[PDB]
Amino acid sequence: DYDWHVFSLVTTIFPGYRDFISFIKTTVDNSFVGWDMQNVITLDTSFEDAKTQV
Amino acid sequence: HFTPTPVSYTAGFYRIPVLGLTTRMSIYSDKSIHLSFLRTVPPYSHQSSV
């Protein structure tokens, strides 16, 4: 509605995130609007600010 | 097939860890439902890796 076609995705290891990611990917791939998804960032554990910083 | 469900429900109400020994169904890996279930045998969905 507000014309925000470029987005990202930041998910932790909280249970039930794979369904979220899969649904978003399929919905993006089956539409005419043309979403320009850039990143799929998944964090591993409590961030050490060592590998999650990059 | 599913006889350790009452124990997991009643214990996971308080978050008291539960260790399973021979149950191998795939539903117990879903941590949204069974909050505090661990087991020493792999489930029926690693034969896919094999």
Side-chain angles (χ1 to χ4, degrees), chain A residues 1-43 45-50 52-54, chain B:
Chain A
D1 259 19
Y2 284 142
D3 274 324
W4 302 333
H5 287 174
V6 174
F7 65 91
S8 314
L9 183 47
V10 181
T11 68
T12 63
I13 56 165
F14 196 72
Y17 67 97
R18 266 165 299 196
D19 300 332
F20 189 68
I21 294 185
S22 299
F23 180 82
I24 279 189
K25 281 186 182 176
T26 66
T27 307
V28 163
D29 287 3
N30 289 345
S31 66
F32 289 96
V33 194
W35 309 94
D36 190 13
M37 185 169 60
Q38 295 179 349
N39 295 116
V40 174
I41 297 173
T42 69
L43 278 50
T45 43
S46 302
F47 56 97
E48 198 77 6
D49 212 8
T52 81
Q53 195 187 3
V54 186
Chain B
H1 305 75
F2 300 98
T3 189
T5 45
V7 177
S8 47
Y9 282 161
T10 314
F13 191 100
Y14 299 110
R15 272 78 169 176
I16 290 182
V18 173
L19 273 91
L21 303 186
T22 61
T23 170
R24 292 188 66 193
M25 308 305 298
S26 322
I27 169 66
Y28 303 109
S29 288
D30 203 350
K31 285 308 178 196
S32 294
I33 316 182
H34 294 70
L35 304 167
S36 57
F37 201 85
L38 295 76
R39 60 190 165 185
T40 71
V41 283
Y44 274 109
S45 53
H46 292 7
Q47 305 170 339
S48 170
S49 296
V50 180

XYZ file of all heavy atoms in Angstrom, unseen atoms left out:
840
model
N 0.820 -1.209 0.000
C 0.000 0.000 0.000
C 0.854 1.259 0.000
O 0.552 2.219 -0.717
C -0.934 0.011 1.207
C -2.340 -0.406 0.858
O -2.530 -1.046 -0.195
O -3.261 -0.084 1.634
N 1.915 1.288 0.805
C 2.710 2.506 0.928
C 3.909 2.546 -0.016
O 4.722 3.468 0.079
C 3.180 2.692 2.369
C 2.108 3.179 3.307
C 2.036 2.710 4.604
C 1.168 4.103 2.898
C 1.061 3.149 5.469
C 0.189 4.549 3.759
C 0.142 4.067 5.043
O -0.830 4.506 5.907
N 4.036 1.569 -0.916
C 5.106 1.531 -1.918
C 6.489 1.402 -1.280
O 7.396 2.190 -1.546
C 5.046 2.750 -2.839
C 4.104 2.554 -4.007
O 4.019 1.419 -4.520
O 3.448 3.534 -4.415
N 6.650 0.391 -0.436
C 7.950 0.010 0.113
C 8.306 -1.349 -0.490
O 8.052 -2.391 0.112
C 7.910 -0.056 1.634
C 7.507 1.215 2.309
C 7.663 2.474 1.830
C 6.870 1.348 3.585
N 7.168 3.388 2.727
C 6.673 2.718 3.812
C 6.446 0.438 4.556
C 6.073 3.202 4.966
C 5.852 0.922 5.700
C 5.671 2.289 5.896
N 8.904 -1.338 -1.678
C 9.133 -2.575 -2.413
C 10.478 -3.230 -2.121
O 10.695 -4.365 -2.554
C 9.013 -2.327 -3.917
C 7.609 -2.108 -4.384
N 7.302 -1.757 -5.678
C 6.429 -2.195 -3.729
C 5.993 -1.631 -5.801
N 5.439 -1.892 -4.631
N 11.383 -2.561 -1.415
C 12.705 -3.098 -1.112
C 12.778 -3.364 0.383
O 12.610 -2.439 1.186
C 13.816 -2.133 -1.549
C 15.163 -2.641 -1.092
C 13.796 -1.951 -3.052
N 13.043 -4.611 0.768
C 13.057 -4.951 2.184
C 14.109 -6.013 2.468
O 14.753 -6.542 1.562
C 11.677 -5.417 2.658
C 11.208 -6.696 2.028
C 11.488 -7.914 2.613
C 10.465 -6.678 0.866
C 11.051 -9.085 2.042
C 10.024 -7.849 0.295
C 10.318 -9.052 0.881
N 14.276 -6.311 3.757
C 15.191 -7.342 4.228
C 14.473 -8.249 5.218
O 13.248 -8.178 5.340
C 16.421 -6.709 4.866
O 16.925 -5.671 4.050
N 15.204 -9.107 5.926
C 14.559 -10.080 6.807
C 15.561 -10.549 7.848
O 16.574 -11.156 7.496
C 14.027 -11.253 5.987
C 13.248 -12.407 6.610
C 12.176 -11.898 7.528
C 12.626 -13.220 5.498
N 15.276 -10.286 9.122
C 16.180 -10.599 10.227
C 15.449 -11.515 11.197
O 14.534 -11.075 11.902
C 16.659 -9.333 10.945
C 17.609 -9.699 12.060
C 17.310 -8.379 9.965
N 15.877 -12.776 11.272
C 15.207 -13.787 12.077
C 16.207 -14.490 12.984
O 17.313 -14.824 12.556
C 14.518 -14.834 11.197
O 15.513 -15.596 10.507
C 13.612 -14.174 10.177
N 15.811 -14.727 14.231
C 16.618 -15.492 15.167
C 16.235 -16.968 15.078
O 15.552 -17.394 14.147
C 16.456 -14.953 16.583
O 15.096 -15.108 16.998
C 16.825 -13.488 16.631
N 16.674 -17.768 16.047
C 16.428 -19.206 16.020
C 15.204 -19.559 16.855
O 15.046 -20.706 17.285
C 17.657 -19.994 16.507
C 18.065 -19.530 17.905
C 18.804 -19.847 15.528
C 19.024 -20.462 18.601
N 14.341 -18.580 17.100
C 13.112 -18.844 17.834
C 12.275 -19.868 17.071
O 12.205 -19.812 15.840
C 12.325 -17.546 18.023
C 11.258 -17.628 19.072
C 11.590 -17.681 20.412
C 9.922 -17.637 18.721
C 10.611 -17.754 21.378
C 8.937 -17.707 19.686
C 9.284 -17.766 21.015
N 11.646 -20.823 17.760
C 10.953 -21.906 17.052
C 9.853 -21.384 16.144
O 9.089 -20.490 16.508
C 10.375 -22.756 18.187
C 11.175 -22.411 19.378
C 11.559 -20.979 19.219
N 9.763 -21.974 14.956
C 8.751 -21.582 14.001
C 9.136 -20.461 13.068
O 8.259 -19.708 12.631
N 10.419 -20.314 12.749
C 10.854 -19.282 11.817
C 10.980 -19.783 10.385
O 10.856 -18.984 9.447
C 12.191 -18.686 12.269
C 13.349 -19.645 12.199
C 14.206 -19.644 11.114
C 13.593 -20.547 13.219
C 15.268 -20.517 11.043
C 14.652 -21.425 13.157
C 15.485 -21.404 12.066
O 16.544 -22.274 11.995
N 11.212 -21.083 10.193
C 11.335 -21.614 8.840
C 10.030 -21.472 8.072
O 10.041 -21.208 6.864
C 11.781 -23.072 8.885
C 13.281 -23.244 8.767
C 13.719 -24.636 9.172
N 13.378 -24.914 10.561
C 13.887 -25.910 11.271
N 14.769 -26.749 10.751
N 13.507 -26.065 12.536
N 8.895 -21.640 8.754
C 7.607 -21.415 8.104
C 7.457 -19.964 7.669
O 6.976 -19.684 6.565
C 6.472 -21.815 9.044
C 6.539 -23.274 9.446
O 7.069 -24.082 8.656
O 6.062 -23.614 10.550
N 7.877 -19.029 8.522
C 7.861 -17.612 8.173
C 8.671 -17.350 6.910
O 8.176 -16.738 5.951
C 8.410 -16.812 9.352
C 8.257 -15.328 9.223
C 7.014 -14.738 9.271
C 9.369 -14.518 9.113
C 6.881 -13.372 9.176
C 9.239 -13.154 9.020
C 7.997 -12.581 9.051
N 9.916 -17.834 6.883
C 10.792 -17.570 5.744
C 10.236 -18.199 4.473
O 10.212 -17.565 3.408
C 12.218 -18.066 6.038
C 12.845 -17.252 7.168
C 13.068 -17.980 4.797
C 14.285 -17.603 7.441
N 9.783 -19.453 4.555
C 9.268 -20.128 3.370
C 8.032 -19.427 2.829
O 7.901 -19.233 1.612
C 8.958 -21.588 3.690
O 10.124 -22.275 4.101
N 7.112 -19.035 3.714
C 5.910 -18.358 3.252
C 6.247 -17.037 2.580
O 5.685 -16.710 1.527
C 4.945 -18.129 4.409
C 3.686 -17.434 4.004
C 2.642 -18.144 3.445
C 3.547 -16.074 4.171
C 1.482 -17.510 3.067
C 2.389 -15.435 3.793
C 1.356 -16.155 3.242
N 7.159 -16.261 3.171
C 7.503 -14.978 2.567
C 8.143 -15.184 1.201
O 7.822 -14.473 0.239
C 8.402 -14.160 3.507
C 7.547 -13.466 4.563
C 9.187 -13.138 2.733
C 8.305 -12.482 5.402
N 9.040 -16.168 1.079
C 9.686 -16.415 -0.209
C 8.669 -16.799 -1.279
O 8.697 -16.267 -2.396
C 10.752 -17.498 -0.073
C 12.057 -17.020 0.528
C 13.107 -18.119 0.504
C 14.397 -17.659 1.160
N 15.417 -18.740 1.228
N 7.758 -17.726 -0.961
C 6.783 -18.141 -1.968
C 5.847 -16.997 -2.343
O 5.545 -16.801 -3.529
C 5.975 -19.343 -1.486
O 5.158 -18.960 -0.377
C 6.895 -20.478 -1.079
N 5.379 -16.228 -1.355
C 4.478 -15.121 -1.657
C 5.165 -14.074 -2.520
O 4.542 -13.492 -3.413
C 3.955 -14.491 -0.372
O 3.386 -15.508 0.459
C 2.886 -13.468 -0.686
N 6.450 -13.816 -2.268
C 7.192 -12.898 -3.124
C 7.306 -13.459 -4.536
O 7.122 -12.735 -5.523
C 8.573 -12.594 -2.516
C 9.490 -11.990 -3.555
C 8.426 -11.655 -1.340
N 7.592 -14.756 -4.661
C 7.791 -15.350 -5.978
C 6.500 -15.578 -6.755
O 6.571 -15.924 -7.938
C 8.543 -16.675 -5.851
C 10.005 -16.478 -5.522
O 10.417 -15.315 -5.342
O 10.745 -17.482 -5.448
N 5.332 -15.400 -6.138
C 4.084 -15.595 -6.873
C 3.222 -14.340 -6.937
O 2.014 -14.408 -6.691
C 3.271 -16.734 -6.255
C 3.883 -18.089 -6.511
O 4.755 -18.237 -7.363
N 3.423 -19.094 -5.777
N 3.814 -13.192 -7.264
C 3.061 -11.949 -7.338
C 3.599 -11.078 -8.464
O 4.735 -11.238 -8.914
C 3.112 -11.180 -6.013
O 4.428 -10.736 -5.736
N 2.755 -10.147 -8.914
C 3.082 -9.235 -10.003
C 3.760 -7.950 -9.545
O 4.277 -7.211 -10.390
C 1.816 -8.863 -10.784
C 1.256 -9.981 -11.613
C 0.242 -10.781 -11.124
C 1.727 -10.214 -12.892
C -0.277 -11.804 -11.890
C 1.209 -11.236 -13.659
C 0.207 -12.030 -13.158
N 3.773 -7.660 -8.242
C 4.240 -6.358 -7.774
C 5.737 -6.183 -7.998
O 6.199 -5.075 -8.293
C 3.864 -6.161 -6.297
C 4.041 -4.714 -5.902
C 2.440 -6.606 -6.059
N 6.519 -7.249 -7.872
C 7.953 -7.147 -8.066
C 8.738 -6.716 -6.844
O 9.372 -5.658 -6.844
N 8.709 -7.537 -5.800
C 9.445 -7.241 -4.580
C 10.939 -7.474 -4.773
O 11.359 -8.500 -5.313
C 8.930 -8.110 -3.438
C 7.452 -8.060 -3.269
C 6.540 -8.911 -3.806
C 6.713 -7.105 -2.508
N 5.275 -8.549 -3.426
C 5.355 -7.440 -2.627
C 7.068 -6.001 -1.735
C 4.353 -6.711 -2.007
C 6.073 -5.279 -1.122
C 4.731 -5.635 -1.259
N 11.743 -6.515 -4.329
C 13.199 -6.591 -4.466
C 13.858 -6.972 -3.140
O 14.621 -6.204 -2.557
C 13.742 -5.263 -4.993
C 15.204 -5.342 -5.396
O 15.736 -6.464 -5.506
O 15.824 -4.277 -5.599
N 13.565 -8.181 -2.664
C 14.178 -8.661 -1.429
C 15.686 -8.768 -1.591
O 16.178 -9.321 -2.577
C 13.591 -10.019 -1.037
C 14.089 -10.531 0.303
S 13.181 -11.959 0.911
C 13.485 -13.122 -0.407
N 16.422 -8.242 -0.613
C 17.879 -8.190 -0.685
C 18.556 -9.277 0.144
O 19.332 -10.071 -0.392
C 18.374 -6.810 -0.246
C 17.958 -5.688 -1.161
C 18.445 -4.351 -0.665
O 18.922 -4.235 0.462
N 18.333 -3.330 -1.503
N 18.266 -9.336 1.444
C 19.004 -10.176 2.379
C 18.064 -11.102 3.134
O 16.904 -10.769 3.382
C 19.784 -9.340 3.413
C 20.879 -8.502 2.793
O 20.835 -7.276 2.844
N 21.883 -9.158 2.226
N 18.580 -12.268 3.502
C 17.925 -13.174 4.446
C 18.950 -13.455 5.537
O 19.776 -14.363 5.421
C 17.437 -14.465 3.786
C 16.890 -15.420 4.831
C 16.375 -14.161 2.744
N 18.912 -12.672 6.608
C 19.905 -12.751 7.672
C 19.320 -13.559 8.817
O 18.292 -13.182 9.390
C 20.321 -11.355 8.155
C 20.982 -10.574 7.023
C 21.245 -11.466 9.352
C 21.278 -9.140 7.370
N 19.969 -14.664 9.161
C 19.601 -15.440 10.335
C 20.749 -15.432 11.332
O 21.885 -15.771 10.989
C 19.253 -16.882 9.968
O 20.438 -17.569 9.552
C 18.236 -16.910 8.843
N 20.441 -15.072 12.567
C 21.411 -15.077 13.647
C 21.484 -16.477 14.235
O 20.529 -17.253 14.173
C 21.030 -14.066 14.728
C 21.382 -12.583 14.576
C 20.968 -12.006 13.234
C 20.722 -11.805 15.694
N 22.642 -16.807 14.801
C 22.877 -18.161 15.285
C 22.494 -18.324 16.748
O 21.673 -19.182 17.084
C 24.346 -18.544 15.079
N 23.070 -17.511 17.624
C 22.761 -17.532 19.048
C 22.734 -16.083 19.518
O 22.634 -15.152 18.711
C 23.772 -18.394 19.819
O 25.095 -18.111 19.349
C 23.472 -19.875 19.638
N 22.801 -15.879 20.832
C 22.967 -14.531 21.358
C 24.193 -13.891 20.721
O 25.305 -14.420 20.817
C 23.109 -14.564 22.880
O 21.980 -15.170 23.485
N 23.981 -12.760 20.055
C 25.023 -12.189 19.214
C 26.226 -11.773 20.049
O 26.094 -11.071 21.055
C 24.478 -10.998 18.418
C 23.877 -9.914 19.266
C 24.616 -8.795 19.607
C 22.568 -10.004 19.708
C 24.067 -7.795 20.385
C 22.015 -9.007 20.485
C 22.764 -7.901 20.823
N 27.404 -12.228 19.628
C 28.659 -11.863 20.267
C 29.196 -10.530 19.765
O 30.214 -10.056 20.280
C 29.696 -12.968 20.030
C 30.901 -12.954 20.965
C 30.583 -13.495 22.343
O 29.459 -13.998 22.546
O 31.462 -13.421 23.226
N 28.526 -9.916 18.788
C 29.056 -8.764 18.062
C 30.389 -9.105 17.403
O 31.280 -8.260 17.295
C 29.190 -7.536 18.970
C 28.972 -6.227 18.226
O 28.575 -6.268 17.041
O 29.194 -5.156 18.827
N 30.534 -10.356 16.971
C 31.742 -10.842 16.316
C 31.490 -11.286 14.884
O 32.183 -10.832 13.967
C 32.348 -11.998 17.126
N 30.519 -12.172 14.667
C 30.120 -12.586 13.330
C 28.779 -12.017 12.897
O 28.543 -11.873 11.696
C 30.063 -14.116 13.238
N 27.897 -11.698 13.847
C 26.625 -11.063 13.519
C 26.786 -9.590 13.170
O 25.912 -9.019 12.507
C 25.652 -11.209 14.688
O 25.935 -10.206 15.672
C 25.804 -12.577 15.323
N 27.875 -8.958 13.614
C 28.109 -7.559 13.278
C 28.284 -7.379 11.776
O 27.701 -6.465 11.177
C 29.335 -7.053 14.031
C 29.485 -5.548 14.046
C 30.800 -5.106 14.659
O 31.635 -5.933 15.026
N 30.992 -3.797 14.767
N 29.071 -8.254 11.146
C 29.240 -8.194 9.699
C 27.916 -8.453 9.001
O 27.638 -7.880 7.940
C 30.319 -9.192 9.246
C 30.602 -9.035 7.760
C 31.583 -9.002 10.063
N 1.502 -45.384 20.062
C 2.342 -44.513 19.249
C 2.729 -43.234 19.988
O 3.882 -42.799 19.915
C 1.628 -44.163 17.939
C 1.187 -45.355 17.148
N 0.099 -46.123 17.500
C 1.685 -45.906 16.016
C -0.053 -47.098 16.621
N 0.897 -46.988 15.711
N 1.783 -42.633 20.712
C 1.987 -41.325 21.322
C 1.730 -41.351 22.821
O 0.981 -40.511 23.331
C 1.068 -40.282 20.685
C 1.279 -40.097 19.211
C 0.463 -40.738 18.295
C 2.273 -39.260 18.745
C 0.648 -40.560 16.944
C 2.463 -39.078 17.393
C 1.650 -39.729 16.491
N 2.314 -42.302 23.530
C 2.032 -42.424 24.955
C 2.822 -41.490 25.880
O 2.414 -41.325 27.034
C 2.229 -43.890 25.385
O 1.756 -44.066 26.724
C 3.680 -44.302 25.277
N 3.956 -40.883 25.466
C 4.558 -39.839 26.309
C 4.069 -38.410 26.075
O 4.851 -37.475 26.269
C 6.049 -39.955 25.985
C 6.088 -40.450 24.640
C 4.957 -41.413 24.524
N 2.830 -38.203 25.623
C 2.324 -36.832 25.537
C 1.832 -36.265 26.872
O 2.080 -35.082 27.144
C 1.216 -36.713 24.489
O 0.291 -37.793 24.625
C 1.801 -36.734 23.095
N 1.116 -37.021 27.717
C 0.708 -36.434 29.003
C 1.872 -35.972 29.855
O 1.802 -34.895 30.468
C -0.065 -37.576 29.672
C 0.400 -38.798 28.994
C 0.603 -38.392 27.586
N 2.959 -36.745 29.890
C 4.112 -36.377 30.705
C 4.735 -35.091 30.188
O 5.042 -34.179 30.962
C 5.137 -37.522 30.736
C 6.347 -37.110 31.522
C 4.526 -38.755 31.346
N 4.931 -34.997 28.872
C 5.558 -33.803 28.315
C 4.690 -32.573 28.526
O 5.208 -31.507 28.859
C 5.870 -33.997 26.835
O 4.767 -34.544 26.150
N 3.369 -32.698 28.365
C 2.490 -31.551 28.595
C 2.546 -31.087 30.047
O 2.781 -29.900 30.328
C 1.058 -31.906 28.212
C 0.789 -31.897 26.734
C -0.309 -32.549 26.211
C 1.624 -31.230 25.860
C -0.567 -32.539 24.864
C 1.372 -31.218 24.509
C 0.276 -31.876 24.017
O 0.020 -31.863 22.670
N 2.343 -32.016 30.988
C 2.286 -31.637 32.397
C 3.623 -31.094 32.888
O 3.659 -30.157 33.693
C 1.857 -32.826 33.248
O 0.736 -33.470 32.635
C 1.457 -32.354 34.621
N 4.735 -31.678 32.439
C 6.037 -31.183 32.866
C 6.375 -29.856 32.204
O 6.835 -28.928 32.873
C 7.117 -32.217 32.571
N 6.145 -29.731 30.897
C 6.435 -28.495 30.205
C 5.553 -27.335 30.600
O 5.846 -26.201 30.208
N 4.470 -27.585 31.339
C 3.767 -26.466 31.959
C 4.700 -25.658 32.855
O 4.621 -24.425 32.892
C 2.568 -26.964 32.761
C 1.642 -25.869 33.210
C 0.477 -25.615 32.522
C 1.925 -25.105 34.325
C -0.378 -24.622 32.927
C 1.071 -24.108 34.729
C -0.080 -23.869 34.030
N 5.593 -26.334 33.584
C 6.531 -25.690 34.498
C 7.935 -25.552 33.930
O 8.809 -25.023 34.619
C 6.622 -26.470 35.814
C 5.340 -26.577 36.588
C 4.681 -27.785 36.705
C 4.804 -25.479 37.227
C 3.515 -27.890 37.421
C 3.640 -25.575 37.945
C 3.001 -26.783 38.039
O 1.836 -26.885 38.755
N 8.180 -26.026 32.712
C 9.512 -26.060 32.110
C 10.486 -26.889 32.950
O 11.513 -26.404 33.421
C 10.052 -24.648 31.877
C 9.668 -24.038 30.548
C 8.253 -23.523 30.560
N 7.968 -22.712 29.385
C 6.780 -22.200 29.095
N 5.728 -22.405 29.871
N 6.641 -21.465 27.996
N 10.146 -28.159 33.125
C 10.997 -29.151 33.775
C 11.483 -30.119 32.702
O 10.662 -30.829 32.110
C 10.248 -29.899 34.886
C 9.988 -28.976 36.070
C 11.032 -31.095 35.329
C 9.302 -29.658 37.218
N 12.786 -30.189 32.421
C 13.254 -30.954 31.258
C 12.875 -32.426 31.328
O 12.897 -33.044 32.392
C 14.772 -30.762 31.305
C 14.949 -29.477 32.009
C 13.884 -29.456 33.064
N 12.531 -32.982 30.167
C 12.087 -34.363 30.034
C 12.954 -35.046 28.986
O 13.120 -34.524 27.879
C 10.601 -34.440 29.643
C 10.207 -35.851 29.343
C 9.747 -33.902 30.751
N 13.509 -36.206 29.333
C 14.363 -36.976 28.437
C 13.610 -38.210 27.969
O 13.153 -39.008 28.790
C 15.665 -37.383 29.123
C 16.806 -36.375 29.046
C 16.767 -35.445 30.234
C 18.133 -37.093 28.960
N 13.481 -38.362 26.655
C 12.856 -39.538 26.089
C 13.886 -40.582 25.706
O 15.017 -40.265 25.359
N 13.485 -41.844 25.761
C 14.432 -42.925 25.549
C 14.191 -43.736 24.289
O 15.156 -44.080 23.610
C 14.432 -43.881 26.748
C 14.743 -43.270 28.108
C 14.843 -44.363 29.136
C 16.022 -42.474 28.055
N 12.952 -44.061 23.955
C 12.694 -44.894 22.792
C 11.693 -44.303 21.812
O 11.616 -44.783 20.680
C 12.205 -46.284 23.219
O 10.983 -46.153 23.949
C 13.240 -46.967 24.087
N 10.904 -43.310 22.213
C 9.968 -42.681 21.290
C 10.714 -42.000 20.150
O 11.665 -41.250 20.373
C 9.091 -41.674 22.034
O 8.352 -40.897 21.090
C 9.932 -40.761 22.898
N 10.276 -42.266 18.919
C 10.983 -41.781 17.742
C 10.094 -41.029 16.757
O 10.519 -40.801 15.622
C 11.674 -42.938 17.014
C 12.825 -43.565 17.771
C 13.582 -44.557 16.901
N 14.249 -43.902 15.783
C 14.769 -44.538 14.744
N 14.710 -45.854 14.639
N 15.356 -43.835 13.780
N 8.887 -40.631 17.145
C 8.027 -39.911 16.220
C 8.588 -38.518 15.947
O 9.425 -38.001 16.690
C 6.606 -39.814 16.763
C 6.006 -41.147 17.175
S 6.015 -42.387 15.871
C 4.995 -41.606 14.635
N 8.130 -37.916 14.850
C 8.666 -36.645 14.384
C 7.972 -35.431 14.983
O 8.457 -34.312 14.792
C 8.570 -36.559 12.862
O 8.850 -37.805 12.255
N 6.858 -35.615 15.693
C 6.115 -34.474 16.224
C 6.846 -33.838 17.399
O 6.754 -32.625 17.612
C 4.683 -34.908 16.600
C 3.968 -33.826 17.410
C 4.699 -36.212 17.354
C 3.706 -32.559 16.642
N 7.600 -34.624 18.162
C 8.235 -34.113 19.368
C 9.402 -33.173 19.088
O 9.911 -32.556 20.027
C 8.702 -35.274 20.244
C 7.589 -36.221 20.625
C 7.521 -37.490 20.098
C 6.604 -35.839 21.511
C 6.510 -38.349 20.443
C 5.590 -36.693 21.859
C 5.549 -37.943 21.322
O 4.535 -38.799 21.667
N 9.840 -33.052 17.837
C 10.878 -32.090 17.489
C 10.343 -30.675 17.343
O 11.139 -29.737 17.231
C 11.569 -32.496 16.189
O 12.397 -33.625 16.380
N 9.026 -30.500 17.325
C 8.411 -29.188 17.140
C 8.370 -28.484 18.488
O 7.507 -28.764 19.318
C 7.016 -29.341 16.549
C 6.548 -28.095 15.840
O 7.215 -27.049 15.973
O 5.516 -28.165 15.141
N 9.296 -27.554 18.707
C 9.456 -26.958 20.027
C 8.386 -25.931 20.366
O 8.376 -25.429 21.494
C 10.833 -26.315 20.155
C 11.948 -27.317 20.320
C 11.642 -28.270 21.451
C 12.721 -29.314 21.588
N 12.267 -30.452 22.418
N 7.505 -25.587 19.429
C 6.384 -24.724 19.777
C 5.363 -25.454 20.634
O 4.673 -24.826 21.442
C 5.715 -24.188 18.514
O 6.573 -23.317 17.807
N 5.258 -26.772 20.480
C 4.223 -27.551 21.148
C 4.794 -28.214 22.395
O 4.306 -27.984 23.506
C 3.620 -28.596 20.195
C 3.365 -27.982 18.822
C 2.325 -29.122 20.745
C 2.727 -28.938 17.853
N 5.825 -29.042 22.221
C 6.510 -29.691 23.340
C 7.680 -28.809 23.743
O 8.721 -28.797 23.086
C 6.966 -31.090 22.955
C 5.838 -32.032 22.696
N 5.014 -31.920 21.601
C 5.385 -33.094 23.400
C 4.108 -32.879 21.634
N 4.310 -33.605 22.716
N 7.509 -28.069 24.835
C 8.438 -27.002 25.182
C 9.750 -27.503 25.778
O 10.765 -26.814 25.655
C 7.772 -26.030 26.156
C 6.459 -25.381 25.714
C 5.779 -24.707 26.887
C 6.699 -24.380 24.601
N 9.760 -28.668 26.428
C 10.917 -29.127 27.182
C 11.179 -30.621 26.974
O 11.233 -31.402 27.915
C 10.734 -28.806 28.662
O 9.550 -29.399 29.151
N 11.332 -31.045 25.722
C 11.519 -32.455 25.395
C 12.870 -32.668 24.726
O 13.151 -32.064 23.686
C 10.395 -32.946 24.486
C 10.211 -34.428 24.496
C 9.429 -35.030 25.456
C 10.803 -35.216 23.540
C 9.251 -36.386 25.465
C 10.627 -36.571 23.544
C 9.852 -37.159 24.508
N 13.688 -33.544 25.311
C 14.951 -34.002 24.742
C 14.924 -35.521 24.655
O 14.228 -36.180 25.429
C 16.154 -33.576 25.593
C 16.542 -32.112 25.771
C 15.623 -31.411 26.738
C 17.959 -32.041 26.270
N 15.667 -36.089 23.710
C 15.704 -37.538 23.596
C 17.051 -38.000 23.060
O 17.759 -37.248 22.387
C 14.568 -38.057 22.710
C 14.576 -37.528 21.303
C 13.300 -37.912 20.596
N 13.114 -37.145 19.374
C 12.031 -37.206 18.616
N 11.016 -37.991 18.926
N 11.967 -36.461 17.519
N 17.394 -39.252 23.363
C 18.681 -39.833 22.999
C 18.628 -40.686 21.735
O 19.637 -41.301 21.379
C 19.229 -40.668 24.155
O 18.455 -41.862 24.284
C 19.154 -39.896 25.449
N 17.487 -40.748 21.054
C 17.384 -41.492 19.798
C 16.930 -40.547 18.691
O 16.040 -39.719 18.921
C 16.429 -42.684 19.937
C 17.103 -43.799 20.678
C 15.182 -42.269 20.673
N 17.504 -40.615 17.494
C 17.091 -39.710 16.422
C 15.743 -40.112 15.855
O 15.394 -41.301 15.841
C 18.208 -39.866 15.383
C 18.715 -41.225 15.598
C 18.613 -41.485 17.074
N 14.964 -39.152 15.355
C 13.606 -39.459 14.889
C 13.565 -40.201 13.565
O 14.577 -40.740 13.115
C 12.966 -38.074 14.768
C 14.104 -37.173 14.508
C 15.251 -37.711 15.293
N 12.387 -40.264 12.956
C 12.176 -40.998 11.718
C 12.511 -40.189 10.471
O 12.300 -40.685 9.361
C 10.726 -41.482 11.630
C 10.454 -42.805 12.311
C 9.725 -42.872 13.484
C 10.906 -43.989 11.765
C 9.469 -44.077 14.102
C 10.654 -45.197 12.377
C 9.935 -45.237 13.544
O 9.682 -46.442 14.156
N 13.011 -38.964 10.615
C 13.293 -38.106 9.474
C 14.784 -37.875 9.232
O 15.141 -36.885 8.586
C 12.575 -36.765 9.637
O 12.858 -36.163 10.882
N 15.665 -38.733 9.754
C 17.075 -38.700 9.374
C 17.443 -39.803 8.388
O 18.511 -39.743 7.742
C 17.965 -38.790 10.617
C 17.895 -37.576 11.492
N 16.995 -36.556 11.279
C 18.619 -37.217 12.578
C 17.164 -35.622 12.198
N 18.144 -35.999 12.998
N 16.564 -40.785 8.220
C 16.738 -41.718 7.124
C 16.756 -40.989 5.791
O 17.307 -41.504 4.814
C 15.632 -42.761 7.182
C 15.580 -43.447 8.525
C 14.360 -44.306 8.695
O 13.359 -44.126 8.009
N 14.434 -45.252 9.618
N 16.200 -39.776 5.750
C 16.342 -38.923 4.579
C 17.803 -38.563 4.324
O 18.266 -38.603 3.175
C 15.499 -37.666 4.763
O 15.789 -36.720 3.761
N 18.551 -38.219 5.375
C 19.976 -37.955 5.200
C 20.702 -39.200 4.713
O 21.586 -39.122 3.845
C 20.594 -37.470 6.508
O 20.052 -36.226 6.903
N 20.340 -40.360 5.263
C 20.987 -41.601 4.823
C 20.750 -41.832 3.330
O 21.670 -42.183 2.576
C 20.501 -42.795 5.658
C 21.179 -44.058 5.183
C 20.798 -42.565 7.114
